[PDB]
C-alpha cells in the first residue's frame, strides 16, 4: 500500500533529520550552569551536614546528665540519623554509579564527570531489570512520613518538609521518570544533589523540632 512519489522522499528526509536530531541537547552554557549550581548545592549539603552533626552534640550532652528525660527522644534522634544517613549514602553511591556509567569505569563524579549524555541516567534509573529508581522511590517514601511519625506535624510546623521531597509529578508518572528520563548526565547528578540537599534540610528541621520539644518538657 505504498506507491507515492514524494512520501518516500519525505520519510527519508525525516529519517536523516531526526537520526541527526538525536545529537541535540541544551547548550553548553546550560550544562555549565547546571555544574555551577550544583557546586553551590554541594556547599549547602556540606553546611547542613556540619550543622546537624553539631546539633547532635547537645542531645549527647543532655543524655549524659538527664537520660530519663530523653529516653523517648535520644533513641529516635539516633535512628532518624541512621536512616537519613543510609538514604544519603545510597544517593551518593547511586550518583557514583551514574557517573561511572556516563563516562567509564574510571570516571569520578565530583568534578571529573566529563560528559553530558542523555541516555546515561535513564539507563541507571529507568532500567526495567534492576532500575534503582523504584528502590529510590520506595526508600525516599519510607523516609517520608517517618519524620511525620516523629513529631506532631502541623501546617505552620514541618508540613513544607513532606511538601518538599514529594513524589507527585505530571499526571501519569512519578519522578522515577520525571527527574531522570532523557536528561543530560550533569542534570542527573545535579538533581540527586538536590535530593541530598533536601533530605539534609528535612533532617535538620526535624532534629530542630525534636530538640525544641525536648526543651518544652525540659523548661
Amino acid at each position: 500500500s505504498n506507491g507515492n512519489a514524494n512520501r518516500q522522499k519525505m520519510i527519508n528526509l525525516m529519517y536523516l533529520v531526526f537520526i541527526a536530531m538525536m545529537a541535540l541537547n541544551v547548550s553548553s552554557e546550560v550544562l555549565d550552569g547546571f555544574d555551577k549550581v550544583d557546586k553551590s548545592l554541594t556547599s549547602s549539603i556540606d553546611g547542613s551536614d556540619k550543622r546537624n552533626n553539631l546539633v547532635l552534640s547537645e542531645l549527647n550532652t543532655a543524655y549524659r546528665t538527664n537520660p530519663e528525660k530523653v529516653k523517648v527522644w535520644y533513641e529516635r534522634s539516633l535512628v532518624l540519623q541512621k536512616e537519613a544517613d543510609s538514604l544519603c549514602t545510597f544517593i551518593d553511591d547511586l550518583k557514583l554509579a551514574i557517573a561511572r556509567e556516563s563516562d567509564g569505569k574510571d570516571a569520578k563524579v565530583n568534578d571529573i564527570r566529563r560528559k553530558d549524555n542523555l541516555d546515561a541516567s535513564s539507563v541507571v534509573m529507568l532500567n526495567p531489570i534492576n532500575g534503582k529508581g523504584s528502590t529510590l522511590r520506595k526508600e525516599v517514601d519510607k523516609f517520608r512520613e517517618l519524620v511525620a511519625t516523629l513529631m506532631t506535624d502541623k501546617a505552620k510546623l514541618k508540613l513544607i518538609e513532606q511538601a518538599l521531597n514529594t513524589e507527585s509529578g505530571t499526571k501519569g508518572k512519578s519522578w522515577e521518570s520525571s527527574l531522570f528520563e532523557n536528561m543530560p548526565t550533569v542534570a542527573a547528578i545535579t538533581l540527586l544533589t538536590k535530593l541530598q540537599s533536601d533530605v539534609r534540610y528535612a533532617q535538620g528541621e526535624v532534629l530542630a523540632d525534636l530538640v525544641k520539644s525536648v526543651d518544652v518538657g525540659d523548661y
Binding site: S1, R7, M10, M14
Partner: protein, 77 residues
C-alpha cells in the same frame, strides 16, 4: 465468520477506488499532521503536542489496515 465478515468487507473496501482514494488521502494527511506535530513539539509551541499524537494514531491505523492486502508480482520475462 462474524469477524471474517468484517475482514472481507474491509478487504474489498481497500480495493475499490473510493476506499483506496480515502486510503491515499489519509496516507498523506497523516504524514502532514506528523510533520506539523514534530515541528510544534520540537520548537516548544502551544497546542502542538496533541496533533503529534493524532498523526501517530493515524499512522497506527494505517499500519493496522495495511495488513489486509496482497502486494506481489514477479516478471521473469
Amino acid at each position: 465468520g462474524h469477524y471474517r465478515r468484517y475482514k472481507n468487507i474491509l478487504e474489498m473496501y481497500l480495493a475499490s477506488h473510493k476506499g483506496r482514494r480515502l486510503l491515499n488521502i489519509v496516507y498523506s494527511w497523516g504524514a502532514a499532521v506528523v510533520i506539523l506535530g514534530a515541528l510544534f513539539k520540537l520548537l516548544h509551541l502551544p497546542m502542538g503536542n496533541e496533533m503529534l499524537f493524532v498523526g501517530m494514531i493515524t499512522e497506527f491505523l494505517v499500519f493496522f489496515i495495511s495488513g489486509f492486502e496482497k502486494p506481489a508480482m514477479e516478471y521473469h520475462w
